[PDB]
Amino acid sequence: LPHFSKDDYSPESKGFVENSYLRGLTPQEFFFHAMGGREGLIDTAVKTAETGYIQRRLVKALEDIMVHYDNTTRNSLGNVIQFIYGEDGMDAAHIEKQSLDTIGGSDAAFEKRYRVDLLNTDHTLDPSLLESGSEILGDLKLQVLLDEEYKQLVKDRKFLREVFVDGEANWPLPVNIRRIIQNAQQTFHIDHTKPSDLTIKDIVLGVKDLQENLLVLRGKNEIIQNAQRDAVTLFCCLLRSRLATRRVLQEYRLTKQAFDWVLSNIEAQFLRSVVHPGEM
């Protein structure tokens, strides 16, 4: 401004408003503040025009893409864009952020929460968690089932870390398993002290059979079956992590009636979250 001296680099010279709106702005500050505002007004006007054209272009490019009854995403020509919408086949309106409990944590914490042993006494299951804890100790048939469960959990951890290199555990997924467990506990009024009537065989088989009912594609051929398995690989990892033998018996203390209720909701919730054919 024609009020300072040439080659002045002080904060006041180059537009530092030392005052507040309550105290008011000096004439030099007022002009500099006005200059900054004019930048915003010009940006707002130009940006509105630029964004409007961009929005129109995007819509016209993707206006003919729709999800068909075979779960494939195709344009007007029928050319395949995605063999399954969103690579999972779910609707964005039914997606919630959930934490994968297997990817995170240390190895020691992983063993303490998931590994269950009936032969040794290092990771033994407390007999008071279930009514059959007395006769469950020393049973090899149940031990192999637990071993099969644990190795699957270990595989999920290896796969999840290979997918998410940064190790982040919170990712969007269709069904909120945590809310379902909370509803089951309160609806049936879990005692939280008396041992549940659940059996290790029931829990392992119950979760395993539930994964089969999570159907996104209903083709009866190898190719569609392979796609169906891949479309629910990430969801099954969340399902197995939450519904673990120790977690169900120890963390959730679910009863047999509650456990059956939880499984039915997950199946119903998952089927409702599938993308509706005909969606634009």
Added chain:
Amino acid sequence: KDQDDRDHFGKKRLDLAGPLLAQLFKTLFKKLTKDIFRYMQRTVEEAHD
């Protein structure tokens, strides 16, 4: 020396009604003068009063 700034208000000029009308009158008067002579050429050649 830095390139001259085109936003400098000192290098700008504001044309008001005066200069705006002056150019319009200058253009129109030129047409009137041209028309006057065209009449003279037509009057001289065609033998008209």
Added chain:
Amino acid sequence: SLMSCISVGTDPMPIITFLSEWGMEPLEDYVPHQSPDATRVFVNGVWHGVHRNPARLMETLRTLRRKGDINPEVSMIRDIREKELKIFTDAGRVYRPLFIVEDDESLGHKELKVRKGHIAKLMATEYQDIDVEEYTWSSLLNEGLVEYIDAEEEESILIAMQPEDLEPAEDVDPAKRIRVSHHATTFTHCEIHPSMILGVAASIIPFPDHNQSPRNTYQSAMGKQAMGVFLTN
């Protein structure tokens, strides 16, 4: 702006003849190597000659403009660093008035040429209409108390925002805003008032310096959309 005015332009020839009589050497006999200190004289963008003592020419030219011999709208700029003297007389230039600051060694420091005695007669003529000798804005301009300055001439002057604190040589109320004195003892002009930077619409906003800049712009547009009394007829 409220005090902004636009020049109408005058004949530059009288200024050119004046320069020739006061030592403006014609460009036909200019040898750069025999005088590598002369100042180039420009009138309306035309290089008319060089002059050996640019200080005296500028002082004489400024004095004539202030007293009234040269039209006040004529703009004069002396680029000391570039050794150029530019005189502008064409129309379309935007200029605004400002106070003139001179040494006045009576008090030992630079001060406005306008004094309380002048302001006394300015108001006397203002209120006598509602009969002392007429004393209008023209009288101030002819007495060398105010000066028209345009953007081109703004480049070579130093302006003090207010005379209250910037002109005097140099507890505080916490409520008052922080003001920068700039501690400069070479001011050549002084703003009539900072509030005159605003226009007609922005002058109706109360406390526009306590508002965010975008809000002031919006109000200027809405004021023109307000019902009132455009005319009494």
Added chain:
Amino acid sequence: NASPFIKRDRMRRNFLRMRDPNEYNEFPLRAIPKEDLENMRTHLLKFQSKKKINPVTD
């Protein structure tokens, strides 16, 4: 700490109420008679060169 009013309607009344020795050799200068300046034009000749051009000898 100040006066937040534009005091008017009585300040107008308020203002209205108070109101050399011979160490030289000078020769005479006279104009050329016009009898010889008619039908004759006297011009200035300027050689543009860095040498000393003299048509009398060069």
Added chain:
Amino acid sequence: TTFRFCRDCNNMLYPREDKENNRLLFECRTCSYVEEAGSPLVYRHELITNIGETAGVVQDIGSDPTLPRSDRECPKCHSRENVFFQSQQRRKDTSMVLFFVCLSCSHIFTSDQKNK
């Protein structure tokens, strides 16, 4: 580098070599005028140049009202009045060093403390 100009026509001379004496000659291209060179340098291209740091310093630099004032000491006349300015080169690689011009002796000094 210094440019040389011809004496007979004012045209600028160009370098030439004389193998008879192995010397440098500056010969005109139009009128055949020659002159032995006083220096062997004929070309220079300063990629990094400091010419123009104090460009614009005149006998009345102190009369400019927009220039700032300072109280630094003049190390040639012991005076406190002076006008300072930054480098006048507009290349966006110069330092912010200040050049001080005394109003009593027209001496120019700098605030540089790294190289001076």
Added chain:
Amino acid sequence: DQENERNISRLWRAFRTVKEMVKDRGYFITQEEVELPLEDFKAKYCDSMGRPQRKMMSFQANPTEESISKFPDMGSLWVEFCDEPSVGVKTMKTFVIHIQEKNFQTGIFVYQNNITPSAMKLVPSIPPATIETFNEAALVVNITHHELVPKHIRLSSDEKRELLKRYRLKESQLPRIQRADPVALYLGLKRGEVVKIIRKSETSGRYASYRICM
């Protein structure tokens, strides 16, 4: 002699990359030779003075048993590394004659700087055998190992037929992959050949996509 070492290191890496290309295409290549140490490479593919001999680097690869079952039409593969930088018509002419002489179904040519147009235009000259030219500089780094590049698996004729039948598609309704694509060149895809791209999806973990060469 720093430049000599740099060239050897670049050549060693290029040779290492070429081995992966042959192995991934479905040819019997052992992991031991794939991970050949640098010192071992110099002991086998150099001479007394140090500079390597490109002629000795040329090798022959045969389809593995698994590849034959999936594709019972793949023949022998010959990989040749040119010695002189500028590949001329003479070198190309003998190279193409070399492949046709011994019934090599596919022939990979590795050059240093460039192949001249008259040599390049001779590339499609021995059907049904296929001739592929690779630049040594481009082979120094294996692009397939990049984290952004997913896994590409070529589909057999039977697999492609089932893919279209189950999805009830046409060859024009599948996603397209350019022949000049660096990955397509790596796998040596032909017109109408579909590749299964198995990439990792943040929404479903694993997602399988198909692209048809164009």
Added chain:
Amino acid sequence: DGPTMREITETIAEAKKKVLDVTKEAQANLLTAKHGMTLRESFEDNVVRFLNEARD
């Protein structure tokens, strides 16, 4: 309140002094430009950051 305003005033004053400190060394040419930046751009970055923090 008054005590807060006094603290706010000194916070800006201290920042202004810090901006002055960097300015003097830059004028002395002793300031070394940050890697990948010029002398003036580096000086501007230091001043801008200091003033932004003062407001915060």
Added chain:
Amino acid sequence: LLSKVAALSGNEGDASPFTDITVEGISKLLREHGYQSRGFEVMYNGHTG
């Protein structure tokens, strides 16, 4: 706040941008008129009183 004082005092407020007028100065005048310095007032709900 300024208008409240002006109406109470029967004056015209000075709302020019750059002046010595401050909120604290206006607040002092407002308190001298028997009102809360910052302009707050105790009001009653019209529905219930």
Added chain:
Amino acid sequence: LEPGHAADQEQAKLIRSAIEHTTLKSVTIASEIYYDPDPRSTVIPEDEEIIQLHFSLLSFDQQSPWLLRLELDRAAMNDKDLTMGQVGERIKQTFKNDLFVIWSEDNDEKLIIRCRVVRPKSLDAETEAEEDHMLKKIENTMLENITLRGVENIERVVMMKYDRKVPSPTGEYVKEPEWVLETDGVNLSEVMTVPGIDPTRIYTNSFIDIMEVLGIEAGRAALYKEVYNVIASDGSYVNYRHMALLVDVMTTQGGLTSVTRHGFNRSNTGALM
């Protein structure tokens, strides 16, 4: 950087300099053309010793008398780790055997390089007039089209420290710092081959280079990353499927088709559409 030297700072400087493009124009103050009648004695006081050094330690009969001199900045050659040996030999290989060059040692007060163009056996009488002009022409080229080291189209490189979460030996995720080089200008094919970098992690802002170097699928992943960054730059979050569908459409034809009238509008989808 390489996984075995990610945390090391010394290796960062070596690779950073190995990829940054530097030209003789950036390490020279002035270029001067001198006239030394004989290639055995000098006229400048400074170079009176350099000639006595190289000549004594050691053809020169056919060396042009016109001399080409460079003054170089030591501060320019220590910001980037360079020695006159590297600079000198680079000029030697620029012109294989057609000029002799002498460069002063680092210990010298001022860095200087002397260059002379050696004339052939045949004598040309017309080249004397342009002999100095020829020196200027080669002088300009030696300033512009000379690559001391690095990769073309790489204006500058700056190093930074990012934090990446990698699994700990115990099994938990622990963040540790690593040295990363950020560059202005893109040469993906050449930079990827430079030794010392991790080729499997190099990323490029321009997905066009990714597409033509890695593949369409790599370009698809890069294209999604760029779109995600822009939307996430302002803090707004959009579901993954929306971004993926747009990216898939832009890469469903085997290439990067734009969203303008020259891209999706050039397909075969009906004139009315």
